[PDB]
Symmetry: D2
Amino acid sequence: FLDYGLSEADPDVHAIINKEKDRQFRSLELIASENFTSKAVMEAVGSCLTNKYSEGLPGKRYYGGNEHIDELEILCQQRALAAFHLDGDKWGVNVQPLSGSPANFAVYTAILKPHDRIMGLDLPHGGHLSHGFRVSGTSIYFESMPYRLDESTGVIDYDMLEKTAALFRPKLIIAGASAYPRDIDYARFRKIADSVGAFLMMDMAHVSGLIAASVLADPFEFVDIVTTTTHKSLRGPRGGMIFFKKDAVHGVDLESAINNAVFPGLQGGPHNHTIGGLAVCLKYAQSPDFKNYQNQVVANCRALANRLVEHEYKLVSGGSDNHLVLVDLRPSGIDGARVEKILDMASITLNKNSVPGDVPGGIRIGSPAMTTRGLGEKEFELIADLIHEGVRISLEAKSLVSGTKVQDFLNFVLAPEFPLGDKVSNLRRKVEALATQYPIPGV
Amino acid sequence: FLDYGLSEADPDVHAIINKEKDRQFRSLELIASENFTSKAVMEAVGSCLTNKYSEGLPGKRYYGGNEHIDELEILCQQRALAAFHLDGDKWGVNVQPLSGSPANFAVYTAILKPHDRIMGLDLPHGGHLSHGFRVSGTSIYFESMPYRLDESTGVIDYDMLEKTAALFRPKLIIAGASAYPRDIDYARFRKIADSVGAFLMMDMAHVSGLIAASVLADPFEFVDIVTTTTHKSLRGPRGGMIFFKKDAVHGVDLESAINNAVFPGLQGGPHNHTIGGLAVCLKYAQSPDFKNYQNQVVANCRALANRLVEHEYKLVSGGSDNHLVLVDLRPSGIDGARVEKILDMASITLNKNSVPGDVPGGIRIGSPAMTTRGLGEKEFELIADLIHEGVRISLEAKSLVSGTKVQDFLNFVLAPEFPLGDKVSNLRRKVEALATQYPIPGV
Amino acid sequence: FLDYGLSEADPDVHAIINKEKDRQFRSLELIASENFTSKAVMEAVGSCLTNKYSEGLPGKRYYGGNEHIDELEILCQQRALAAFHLDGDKWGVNVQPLSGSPANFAVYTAILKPHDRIMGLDLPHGGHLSHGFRVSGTSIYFESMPYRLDESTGVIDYDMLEKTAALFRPKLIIAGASAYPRDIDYARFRKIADSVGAFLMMDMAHVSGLIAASVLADPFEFVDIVTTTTHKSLRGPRGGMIFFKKDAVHGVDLESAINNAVFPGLQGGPHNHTIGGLAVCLKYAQSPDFKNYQNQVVANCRALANRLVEHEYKLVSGGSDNHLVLVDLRPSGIDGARVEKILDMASITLNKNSVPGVPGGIRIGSPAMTTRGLGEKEFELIADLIHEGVRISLEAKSLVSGTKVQDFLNFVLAPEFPLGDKVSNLRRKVEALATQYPIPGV
Amino acid sequence: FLDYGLSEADPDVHAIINKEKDRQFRSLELIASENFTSKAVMEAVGSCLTNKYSEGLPGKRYYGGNEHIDELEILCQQRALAAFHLDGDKWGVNVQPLSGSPANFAVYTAILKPHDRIMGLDLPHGGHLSHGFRVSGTSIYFESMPYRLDESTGVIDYDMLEKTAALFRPKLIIAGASAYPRDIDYARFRKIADSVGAFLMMDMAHVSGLIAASVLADPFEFVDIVTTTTHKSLRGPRGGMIFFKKDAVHGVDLESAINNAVFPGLQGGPHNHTIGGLAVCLKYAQSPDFKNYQNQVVANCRALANRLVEHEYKLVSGGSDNHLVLVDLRPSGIDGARVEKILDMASITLNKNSVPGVPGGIRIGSPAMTTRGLGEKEFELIADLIHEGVRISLEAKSLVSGTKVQDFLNFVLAPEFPLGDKVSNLRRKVEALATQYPIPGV
């Protein structure tokens, strides 16, 4: 009977959310996997759509009362196809996966038997866990072998992939990556997949919006299946999708196989509130404004990358074609673990990241979140300068601490006696003075 | 830059959500897996918590900027333990699983190797897909064998489980079920698990709130691991949890194993907005009001069950100890598929369901959703009467249609010429006159 | 360069063979799995057939020079079909498996995927390791679940097998057993297999000769596939065979699959010397004398069973339909391992065996001594000699303080051993029976 | 009841053995995998050892009556250790495997779980089926990936193996090969295995005699486990052995694991007759005459290799370090299957073999004819006879219109066959060499 609002029911959680909102506002959020979703997405996600149970697909449901839920899921499917410029006679989409990892695992389950062979980009070389690392589900239930970047160039070693694929004979080759700063040679992937009769998939989670806006090459010209999250580059809620060819691929009806793998294979009832949010975000993904945003994402990342290399940083692969840079900190005399911490103390949020030639040696930096807030190229050049000051503080601290462990560094910088506190505060002040000039979307 | 509300950005989706809200309001929602969550849960779920990326656990994260996210997840953990009256020195909880199915699959991944042996309640006998049916993930990656209800009684055949477990030698035995209307003999489960050295798990998704309020027996006195959804009986957002013993169980550190299985095993970054919602709902789960609600859930289901059996329906297992009844329609001369459809046309939402002795022969009916709205025992007796009128319409229609297929029935009842339309409308009018007397929670 | 006989080339090996020859002559060999093969089988096995490498099948060899090997292999196949009264348009046979376990494992490899489900008779209830039964390779690479004997009747619990198969859904059900003293209800097995869509196989290793001689029921009326060893009741060399229907079964061409599973799947070149000896024994398996022998095997076992019952021993299932009995020694106050050792010291050679409920039983078989010419009256005498052996075993057990079977072994092996004179006296009786009878062999 | 000799009991089998004996005498047997075993081995194999059921290990048997079988099995083990110059505190050996493939499969079963990763030499690059290499059982139950020969040098591409193993992470790397004409760089294999934490095994089936005689390098200095057949270069009966370190390796007690994998894992009762013959051959493998024989094997192969090069044939890797050559016939304008058949019709028995790049090659080995007493000069004559055979094969191919190898087989098998006189003339030369030489055997 009692139906209180959040501030009425639970002031501790309301206070935490407000603090998180305010932290987001005050900080340079440079995590490449983050974005700020819109008020409309949040309202859709925070709605009574959460209440409906609806196993199965539209028109073929396992519970009553699904008229409107079916209209929504159909709408969401249609908008997903339109956003990626897909003919619905050639492609279908499943919009129920709960996230990017389950989306991938549904594909594996759909087209592979257990212990079938998969190749994906190696985790230290920029790939994602769900492509194989036995640490990952992918590696537990299937037989994965990585392909790697050239350690000397930071570019995918296509010739070595071609030789290793002929020996290992994968049934699936996954393109796509977490921390790969360059565009993929999809034709080369297709050639290599065909050389062994493999399925070819793209996990476009990190670049989906850039693909939708035609800033990057289109994997849909070459691959059989495309998976994605919906919250990064797309600016949507936390969800996942799987796109598939409708024509049979190596004698497999991918539509049935994938649908069956999502439900009843791995999931129960879909999260309709999320599907609502998704529908909202895919409408916006078709717009000229979204296309402009994505060009600005890439322009901002380039302005950042250029200013970083003026400060003498090394960038894995020499630069970026997309929304992220991977900085190799080792030639500047430090690692990503130490740097990440100091930057975070100064309200610059990003992540340490392994670089080729393995504590991780790099940091990953992305432009989408702050681009959403309205920062342009000039502001991204200032971000680079601020990151530079933070790396200089980190080098000074690494020098001053006596212990040589990462944990010794941590203890040193988090101690109340920390002698560089004033430099951190001073950097934090400038970080917040930049970030707080810009609005932040959301309810 | 553009940050419109939902009605501003996307009137088609706003209109669908409103329609869904209004359908929920007008209908008797009797799906046992559904509930109406509170305004506070929705506000937490529809918040900027969705924007944060936070791989790992509190205090041990893989990205910067997680001060408040960590405070929230710790809070959520603490409230989960308090809601189930658990000592934190004996139990831990992981609150990141994306739903009930992934939660189960994380447990399997944590404590089993591929092809290890699992026993769970058979799907036609009331179990859930994720316990094994090769249709399910559980059955694809592991070796499942069902245990069954007595087809003659509708009660779990404990003696046959005990004999079959000695022969099959499961490494895991799962208690818990989708459509089991009685309480579980947990001591007997423990005895049987010990007889073969198996792990013992309870999937309490369908009864979690009843367990929290001490209406049913406590699986935590007997089992090693407990999984659950958060949206059914608990009245929370769409999520999942896994509870585990902290003492080693058959030489396994369940805490590390389960945490590792959730991430990096099966999932990426947690859905913090959902964790927010969850925290909210677990606060309310500790309250006297929640305890009263759960006693009313069970009282309402009993009033419904008693009125149904006065109309001469057969109930699987003879009745119910909980929030649901499973009606065996075969002795009344009809199946669940036909009945479900007519009821749904009259705004009574439930689901067809297999009954023991296999189109499915039953319907499953639950009290939580309408109990939340404020219906008492008298109103549930009226619900039974309304269901009875719908079953009578369904029998009349089954008689009048010429084709003997379920699809022939469907075509007949959905046709504009449908000769019993006036009886359906008349029943629908009375259904809506009941439901629209009560408020509905949410934003 | 110099091609000496064995006694000249290697007197130590020659000596050991001389000892074993003598041991065989002096003992009562009652291992149900043993027999005495013929001079003719041994001559083929010890021939120049051992020199030829012949991977593939008759007329499709990976090596040259196999004209005569192909001839032999086909002859061997036609004699296997004839020995079991099989129409060649309905049944085929692969005579390449090296033994029984590899024969079985080749069938699994042929018709199953890894981790597919198999049921067979539980190991303590008379099963073989390579069946339903992680100890065995069958349980390692596949998912096995046992079915058991009804412990109160000592018969296969077909009612419980029907129920458990319905839940477990095996892809393959295996009948046949090492220590099952009754015939198999094949129709009931077929009914059960068909209820789950399973392949049905009989492993007839222990009873193959009795099937060939129509003393027991014919698994070929009902099953899809039959495996066997060639050395036990068939009295051939050590090898294996796989029989299979030639009509497709559950969509599988069993011929193609089984042939590919044996080679290149699990083996290389066949053992052509073995195949030579196998052909010899399969010719003999068609003779009236072989049918007479097999009838005597069963009658000898019945004579022994009945006399052991007169001595108040409990037989699993109350007797036997075949060549073996399984004695439950627990009611007599001792296990099978202690008894096996004492009997062995008095030249009565059998084996400890699990019974329904250290092993509680011994398994006793008639084929080997029936080959040598013993009749029913001699088998009653064998039962008396066994009984005396069991009494000495009981007596030796009471002299032992430690309850560990290793302590017993140590006690009885010691040169001091205080019941040595009882054992010698028994041994004298045992040898005085045995040494009246010829022994086949080179 | 009546124990006749083979010629009386079964004249048809006797006849076939007579034919094969004659075939062996008249032919040049050049299958690298064949040899001619001794009269003494054959006498042990054709003995009463075949009658004994002996599951378990020396002194821990599941059956009674194995006093003398235990004696033999231990003798056989000590002679295997001695034949390969092994300290018994560091190495153990299991002499029960029935053949080479089961030996290998027992090792996998012992130290690996199902779907664990294995690398071995690719089948078209000279590997054996039971290795790295779904065709083989090794590839069915485990996850195999091949390593290959550098196609421009015909040597193992160790640089590419080092890279691919780093990515694939095999739990087991297998050295050894059916058709590899050079010695193995064991130190480099050890280095590679250690880089991924792999077990390292050598399958020495093709070269075991040459290792025993120290003609090739010793895999025992570097590997964890060695498997072998007993019939090829060892000149024993058909069987297998597994050698293993007794110190723990990557946390595994290899002795316990391997013994359990052979029995009860994959086999039943051992073949004691085979073990008898194995003991005989292992005694001979320690003699100076065996070392002299093995040196002659290699010299004969070198004499043949060099003469084939004078005839402008391409040998894979440009020659050989061992008992075999692998001829790439593609530059000469024909495949190995056509050539194998023609050579076989002229009593030159070898096998078609894949080469790097229908099989393009033939494999030729010296052991069998060196056993009979041929020297270097005779092996040069063999190369000349092969050359003539290849010319007739080319000529017969031009008379054939269809490009299918089955059409060729049909052409040459036909009684009309118009090059019959060329083949007879060659055959006369081949037999006139062969029939000057004795043949060992009973």
